[PDB]
Amino acid sequence: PRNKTRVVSYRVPHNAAVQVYDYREKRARVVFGPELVSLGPEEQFTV
Amino acid sequence: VSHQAGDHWLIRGPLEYVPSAKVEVVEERQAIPLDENEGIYVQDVKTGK
């Protein structure tokens, strides 16, 4: 079971992109390539 | 500070309290924690708003 208190992170694959929206800072971001994407308290992944 | 009979007031925060013989403790009351997007609805019963 996932420890809900730990920062949620996703390892983005090579030649892929992830879209995240910060529902509190109101800032949109798309992360390309191999990178570790971590979500702030109110950020959410686009599914 | 002065209060009329039947007045309510709130005391808060880091303190010691012993109720004066003229005072009734009505309830224990506690803060509600809320992040920058979270909220509550409150009714001000004196005005109704």
Side-chain angles (χ1 to χ4, degrees), chain A:
Chain A
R2 182 183 62 106
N3 178 338
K4 299 190 181 184
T5 70
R6 294 302 236 252
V7 166
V8 172
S9 305
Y10 183 68
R11 275 186 268 96
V12 189
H14 294 258
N15 296 294
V18 169
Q19 182 172 58
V20 186
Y21 191 73
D22 192 326
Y23 283 102
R24 191 175 69 174
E25 292 283 299
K26 305 182 176 199
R27 285 188 275 144
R29 64 180 173 130
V30 173
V31 184
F32 285 107
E35 190 142 15
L36 186 79
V37 174
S38 292
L39 300 184
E42 299 307 328
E43 276 183 301
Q44 297 293 348
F45 292 118
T46 301
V47 188

Side-chain angles (χ1 to χ4, degrees), chain B residues 1-3 6-13 15 17 23-32:
Chain B
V1 177
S2 63
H3 301 284
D7 277 335
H8 291 179
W9 65 103
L10 181 85
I11 64 167
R12 174 172 191 181
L15 62 76
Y17 190 73
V23 178
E24 167 181 289
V25 177
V26 188
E27 66 170 34
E28 295 158 33
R29 206 156 169 113
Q30 186 167 350
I32 300 162

